[PDB]
Design a protein around this ligand. Structure first.
Ligand SMILES: *[C@@H]1O[C@H](CO[C@H]2O[C@@H](C)[C@@H](O)[C@@H](O)[C@@H]2O)[C@@H](O[C@@H]2O[C@H](CO)[C@@H](O[C@@H]3O[C@H](CO[C@H]4O[C@H](CO)[C@@H](O)[C@H](O)[C@@H]4O[C@@H]4O[C@H](CO)[C@@H](O)[C@H](O)[C@H]4NC(C)=O)[C@@H](O)[C@H](O[C@H]4O[C@H](CO)[C@@H](O)[C@H](O)[C@@H]4O[C@@H]4O[C@H](CO)[C@@H](O)[C@H](O)[C@H]4NC(C)=O)[C@@H]3O)[C@H](O)[C@H]2NC(C)=O)[C@H](O)[C@H]1NC(C)=O
Ligand SMILES: *[C@@H]1O[C@H](CO[C@H]2O[C@@H](C)[C@@H](O)[C@@H](O)[C@@H]2O)[C@@H](O[C@@H]2O[C@H](CO)[C@@H](O[C@@H]3O[C@H](CO[C@H]4O[C@H](CO)[C@@H](O)[C@H](O)[C@@H]4O[C@@H]4O[C@H](CO)[C@@H](O)[C@H](O)[C@H]4NC(C)=O)[C@@H](O)[C@H](O[C@H]4O[C@H](CO)[C@@H](O)[C@H](O)[C@@H]4O[C@@H]4O[C@H](CO)[C@@H](O)[C@H](O)[C@H]4NC(C)=O)[C@@H]3O)[C@H](O)[C@H]2NC(C)=O)[C@H](O)[C@H]1NC(C)=O
Ligand SMILES: *[C@H]1O[C@H](CO[C@H]2O[C@@H](C)[C@@H](O)[C@@H](O)[C@@H]2O)[C@@H](O[C@@H]2O[C@H](CO)[C@@H](O[C@@H]3O[C@H](CO)[C@@H](O)[C@H](O[C@H]4O[C@H](CO)[C@@H](O)[C@H](O)[C@@H]4O[C@H]4O[C@H](CO)[C@@H](O)[C@H](O)[C@H]4NC(C)=O)[C@@H]3O)[C@H](O)[C@H]2NC(C)=O)[C@H](O)[C@H]1NC(C)=O
Ligand SMILES: *[C@H]1O[C@H](CO[C@H]2O[C@@H](C)[C@@H](O)[C@@H](O)[C@@H]2O)[C@@H](O)[C@H](O)[C@H]1NC(C)=O
Ligand SMILES: *[C@@H]1O[C@H](CO)[C@@H](O)[C@H](O)[C@H]1NC(C)=O
Ligand SMILES: *[C@H]1O[C@H](CO)[C@@H](O)[C@H](O)[C@H]1NC(C)=O
Lengths: 99, 265, 205, 205
C-alpha cells in the first residue's frame, strides 16, 4: 500500500548560533519511492544538498537522508519540504533547535 | 551480524530514479551501492580502504548484473500483463550459523507488500499471489536462475560476510559515545516539553531514561536517525508539568559509555 | 444514514491493485456537512482515508463518501475495520464495522461450455462458464478472447447451492463468426481459495 | 424496512395454487407488534386477504405473513396492488405497491447442456439448462426425471443482459451414475411468452 512520509529535521552536532554545522532531513516510512525533497532557509531552496542512497526497512518502506552544511543564527530559520503522492499539499517541517 | 542486499526496480521514472539499484549492508552500515546506469558495484566510504582480493568488487558487480536483469525482466513482463506502475523489491542476504554456514533470507515485495519467497536449498519460488506466478515463473523459466540465485545466498553470501568480519573489524568494532543535551520548550498550554538529544554516536543502540528527583520517570518517546556522518542521531520527548522543569534530568546507556550518562538543563 | 462496503474481490486478490473499504453517508439537508470521519483497524485509529467532499443527489439530500485504502493481508487475516461518522446534528456518533466473512476458503471448480448446437443458427452465440463450489461468495469472473479482456458478458449473481457452497454462471456473447474463426475464449477467475487466487479455462473449435 | 412482493409465476400461470400479492413485515421487537393491513387494488381496499396472525421469529422480530388473493387477469394488465398498512404504535411503519413489469412479453430460448467432459470424473455431476433472453423477469424453472420432478436443482437469479432481456441458468446435480445410464432430464420453463406459457428441452446419454 502507499504510505506517507516521516519528516524529521535535526543537526549533526549540538547547534550553537554562528558556528559551522550540518543540517539533516530524515525522510522515512514512505511508499512508493518517487519523491521530491528539499531544504529551505527562511523559505528559499538551499542548494547543492547531498542525499544518501535510497534504502528501505524490513517493512519495505523507503528511508533517505538529505543534508547540507549551514550555520545557525537567531534570525535564519531552516526547514525541510517534501512532495509525495500521499501528500495533498507539500508538507514543510520546520527545524526545532532542540532536537 | 548479517550481510543484507536491498534490491529495487521501478517503472515510474518521473523523478530521476534509475530503473534498478541496490545497496549492501553489513549490520547497520552500508558498504555497497549499485544501479543500472553506473553499471557497476562500488564500495562505500569506510569500506573503500578495506583490504580485499582483487576480484572482490569484480564479483559483486557481476553478481548484481544478474539480479538486475531478473528484476528488469520482471518489471517489463509485469508492466505488460498489468495496468499501473510498480515497485519490485527484494531482501537478499545471510547471517552466519554459529558454526560456519549460511542462514539465508530472500523475500520479495511488490508495490509495498510481500508476495514472494525463494528457498535456496530447494531452489524454488513460493507465494500466494497472481504476481507470484507471473514473476516466479519468468525466472524459473531460465536454466541459470535457480542455480545462480541459490549459489549467491548459500556460497558467495556467507563467504563475503566471513571476509568482512576478518578484514573489517576496525569498522564493525568501531565505537563512539553520544553527546547529550537536554532542553525545555514552552510545549502545550501551561505545560512544557523536555527534549533529550543524543549527537553523533555509532552503534544505533541507545537507552534514554528520564529522572525526576533522581528516581525513574519514564523513557519519553525515542527516535533515532542517521547523521550521514555514518554515525547516528537520537532524541526523546517528555511532556511535563510546567514550572517543574528542573526536577528532571536525562540519562543514557550506550557501549560508547563505560557508565550511564546523566545530563542536566 | 451510514453504509459500509467491503473491497472488490479483485483488488484484494491481486497485490498490484488497491482494495479500499468504503463508508457512505446519505440524507443531509445541509446540516454541518463537515461530517467528521474516524477509521480504525482492530480498534486503532488511522488517518489514511480519502474522504470525498459531499454531493447533492436528485432529492435535495446531501451524500458523502470515505474510502479507506487497505493492506491486502489486513483483510485476508481477519482485521476489523470500523468507520464512525460524526456530526452535531447527529445525536450520538454513528458507527459501522466489517471484516472478511468468516469460513474456510473453499475454492471453485471451473468449466467452459461451447454454444449449444441448437444455438448454432442465430447471428450471435453464447459461450458459457460454470464456476462452482466456492465459499465464501467473494469472487471475480471475466472473459478474454485471445487474452483480451472482453466486454460482452454478464455474470450471474453467486447462488448458494444445496451443499452450502456457491456457484454462478458467466455468459460471453459473440458473433457466431468470431466463434468459428477459431479464436480462443478464456474464463478467468479470482477466488481466495485457488492457488495464487486465480485460475483460467479456455475453449475453441 | 418492509418491501412488497409479487406472485409465484407458477401460480399466476395456471399452476394449482392461487397467485398471492404478498407483503412480508419485519423489524419489530418481541413486545411491540403492530402492523395492520388495508390492501387497495387500484385505490380500492379489498379484504380478500388473510394476515397470518402476528407470528414471531428468533432474532426478536415478526415473521409476518399477510397473503392477498388476486386474479391472473389483474396482474397481467399493469394493475397495481397497494399494501397500505395502518399502525400508530410503531416508529417507522411501512407501505409498498407493485404491478406487472409493463412490457411486451418476450419468450426465452431454452437449451440444455451435458455435464462438461472434465466434470465427468467427480462423484456427482452438473446438468445445465441455459434459459436465454426473456422478459419480463417473472419466470419459473424446474427439472424432471423421465417425468419425475426433482429437488436437487438450483436456479441462478434472473440476470439482466446487455440487451434488456434476461437470462438465468439452472443447475441440476446428480450422481455421476444417474448420467451414464441414460435418463430423461428435462428443463421445464414457465413464461408468458412461450407457446402455451411453457416448453421443455431434454437430454440423455
Ligand atoms: C437521495 O439519493 C441517494 C442516492 O441516490 C439514489 O436515489 C434513490 C432515489 C435511488 O433510487 C437512486 O436514484 C439513487 O441510487 C439515496 O441514498 C441511498 O440511501 C439508501 C438508504 O437505505 C441506501 O441503501 C443502502 O443501499 C445498499 C446498497 O448500496 C449499493 O448499491 C447501490 C445501488 O443499488 C449503489 O448506488 C451504492 O453505491 C452501493 O453500491 C456499492 O457501492 C460501493 C461504493 O459506493 C462500491 O464499492 C460497491 O462495489 C457497490 N456494490 C455493488 C456491487 O453494487 C444496501 O446494501 C443497504 O442495505 C442495508 O440496509 C437495509 C435497510 O436498512 C437492510 O435491509 C440490509 O440488510 C442492509 O443492512 C445490512 O444488512 C446486513 C445483513 O442483511 C448486516 O450484516 C449489516 O450489518 C447491515 N448494515 C449495517 C452495517 O448496519 C441499503 O439498502 C443507498 O445505498 C443510497 N444510495 C447510494 C448513494 O448508494 C438517498 O436515500 C436519497 N435521499 C432521500 C431518502 O430522499
Ligand atoms: C430479523 O430476521 C428477519 C427475518 O429473518 C432473517 O434474519 C436475517 C438475519 C437473515 O440473515 C436470515 O437469518 C433471515 O431470513 C429480518 O427480515 C428481513 O428484513 C430485510 C430488510 O431489508 C428484508 O430484506 C428484503 O429482502 C427481499 C428478499 O426477500 C426474499 O428472500 C428472502 C431470503 O433472502 C426470503 O426470506 C423472503 O421470504 C423473500 O422471499 C420471497 O418470499 C415470498 C413470500 O415471503 C415468496 O412468495 C417468494 O417466492 C420468495 N422469493 C424468493 C424466490 O426467494 C429483497 O427483495 C428486498 O430488497 C429490496 O430492498 C433493498 C434494500 O432497501 C433494495 O436494495 C432492493 O432493490 C429491494 O427494493 C426494491 O427494489 C426494486 C428494484 O431494485 C424496486 O422496484 C422496488 O420498488 C424496491 N422495493 C420497494 C417496493 O420499495 C429486501 O432486501 C428480508 O426479506 C427480511 N427477511 C425475510 C422475512 O424474508 C429482520 O431484518 C431481522 N431483524 C433485524 C434487523 O434484526
Ligand atoms: C515450485 O515449483 C512448482 C511451481 O511453482 C509455483 O507454484 C505455485 C503454486 C505458486 O507457489 C507459484 O508462485 C510458483 O511459481 C511447484 O509445483 C506446482 O504445483 C502445482 C500444484 O499441483 C501445479 O499446479 C497446476 O498448474 C497447472 C497449470 O500450470 C494447472 O493446470 C493445474 O490445475 C489443476 O490441478 C490443480 C492441482 O494439481 C487443481 O488445484 C486445479 O483446480 C486444477 O484441477 C482441476 O480442477 C480445476 C477446478 O477449477 C479445473 O479448472 C482444472 O481444469 C482441473 N484440472 C485439469 C483437468 O486441467 C494445477 O493448478 C503447478 O503446475 C506446479 N508447477 C509447475 C508450473 O510445474 C513445486 O511444487 C514447487 N517446488 C517445491 C519444492 O515444492
Ligand atoms: C569456522 O570458522 C569460524 C571463524 O574462524 C575463521 O576465521 C579465523 C578465526 C580463521 O583463523 C579460521 O578460524 C576461520 O577461517 C570459527 O569460529 C570456527 O571454529 C570454525 N569451525 C571449525 C571449528 O572448524
Ligand atoms: C509519545 O509517543 C506516543 C506514540 O505512541 C504518542 O501517542 C504520544 O502522544 C507521545 N507523547 C509525547 C511525549 O509527546
Ligand atoms: C488502467 O485501467 C483502466 C484502463 O482503461 C483505467 O481505470 C485506467 O486507465 C487505469 N487504472 C487507473 C484508474 O488508474
Amino acid at each position: 500500500i502507499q504510505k506517507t512520509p516521516q519528516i524529521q529535521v535535526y543537526s549533526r552536532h549540538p547547534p550553537e548560533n554562528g558556528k559551522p554545522n550540518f543540517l539533516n532531513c530524515y525522510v522515512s516510512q514512505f511508499h512508493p519511492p518517487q519523491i521530491e525533497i528539499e531544504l529551505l532557509k527562511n523559505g528559499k531552496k538551499i542548494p547543492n544538498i547531498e542525499m544518501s542512497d535510497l534504502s528501505f526497512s524490513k517493512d519495505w518502506s523507503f528511508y533517505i537522508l538529505a543534508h547540507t552544511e549551514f550555520t545557525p543564527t537567531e534570525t535564519d530559520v531552516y526547514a525541510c519540504r517534501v512532495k509525495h503522492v500521499t501528500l495533498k499539499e507539500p508538507k514543510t517541517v520546520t527545524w526545532d533547535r532542540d532536537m | 551480524l548479517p550481510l543484507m542486499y536491498h534490491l529495487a526496480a521501478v517503472s515510474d521514472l518521473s523523478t530521476g530514479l534509475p530503473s534498478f539499484w541496490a545497496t549492501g549492508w553489513l549490520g547497520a552500515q552500508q558498504y555497497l551501492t549499485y544501479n543500472n546506469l553506473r553499471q557497476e558495484a562500488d564500495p562505500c566510504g569506510a569500506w573503500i580502504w578495506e583490504n580485499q582480493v582483487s576480484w572482490y568488487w569484480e564479483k559483486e558487480t557481476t553478481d548484481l548484473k544478474s539480479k538486475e536483469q531478473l528484476f528488469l525482466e520482471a518489471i517489463r513482463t509485469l508492466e505488460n500483463q498489468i495496468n499501473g506502475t510498480f515497485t519490485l523489491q527484494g531482501l537478499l542476504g545471510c547471517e552466519l550459523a554459529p558454526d560456519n554456514s549460511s542462514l539465508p533470507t530472500a523475500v520479495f515485495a511488490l508495490n509495498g507488500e510481500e508476495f514472494m519467497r525463494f528457498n535456496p536449498r530447494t531452489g524454488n519460488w513460493s507465494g500466494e499471489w497472481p504476481e507470484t506466478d507471473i514473476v516466479g515463473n519468468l525466472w524459473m523459466k531460465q536454466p541459470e536462475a535457480a542455480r545462480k540465485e541459490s549459489e549467491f545466498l548459500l556460497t558467495s553470501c556467507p563467504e563475503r560476510l566471513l571476509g568482512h568480519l576478518e578484514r573489517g573489524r576496525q569498522n564493525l568494532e568501531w565505537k563512539e559515545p553520544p553527546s547529550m543535551r537536554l532542553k525545555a520548550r514552552p510545549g502545550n498550554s501551561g505545560s512544557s516539553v523536555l527534549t533529550c538529544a543524543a549527537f553523533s554516536f555509532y552503534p544505533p543502540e541507545l537507552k534514554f531514561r528520564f529522572l525526576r528527583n533522581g528516581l525513574a520517570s519514564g523513557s519519553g518517546n525515542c527516535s533515532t536517525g542517521p547523521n550521514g556522518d555514518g554515525s547516528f542521531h537520537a532524541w526523546s520527548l517528555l511532556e511535563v508539568k510546567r514550572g517543574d522543569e528542573h526536577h528532571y534530568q536525562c540519562q543514557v546507556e550506550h557501549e560508547g559509555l563505560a557508565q550511564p550518562l546523566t545530563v542536566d538543563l | 444514514s451510514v453504509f459500509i462496503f467491503p473491497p472488490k474481490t479483485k483488488d484484494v486478490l491481486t497485490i498490484t491493485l488497491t482494495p479500499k473499504v468504503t463508508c457512505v453517508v446519505v440524507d443531509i439537508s445541509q446540516n454541518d456537512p463537515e461530517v467528521r470521519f474516524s477509521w480504525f483497524i482492530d480498534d486503532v485509529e488511522v488517518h489514511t482515508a480519502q474522504t470525498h467532499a459531499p454531493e447533492k443527489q436528485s432529492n435535495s439530500t446531501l451524500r458523502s463518501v470515505s474510502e479507506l485504502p487497505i493492506v491486502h493481508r489486513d483483510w485476508l487475516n481477519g482485521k476489523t475495520f470500523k468507520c464512525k461518522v460524526n456530526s452535531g446534528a447527529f445525536p450520538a456518533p454513528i458507527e459501522k464495522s466489517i471484516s472478511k466473512p468468516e469460513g474456510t476458503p473453499r475454492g471453485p471448480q471451473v468449466y467452459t461450455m461451447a454454444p449449444p448446437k441448437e444455438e448454432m443458427t442465430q447471428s450471435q452465440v453464447s459461450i458459457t462458464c460454470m464456476v462452482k463450489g466456492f465459499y465464501p461468495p467473494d469472487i471475480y469472473t471475466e472473459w478474454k478472447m485471445n487474452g483480451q479482456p472482453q466486454e460482452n458478458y454478464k455474470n450471474t449473481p453467486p447462488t448458494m447451492d444445496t451443499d452450502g457452497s456457491y456457484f454462478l454462471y458467466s455468459k460471453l456473447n459473440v458473433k457466431k463468426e468470431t466463434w468459428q474463426q477459431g479464436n480462443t475464449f478464456t474464463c478467468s477467475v479470482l477466488h481466495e481459495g485457488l492457488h495464487n487466487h486465480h485460475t483460467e479455462k479456455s475453449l475453441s473449435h
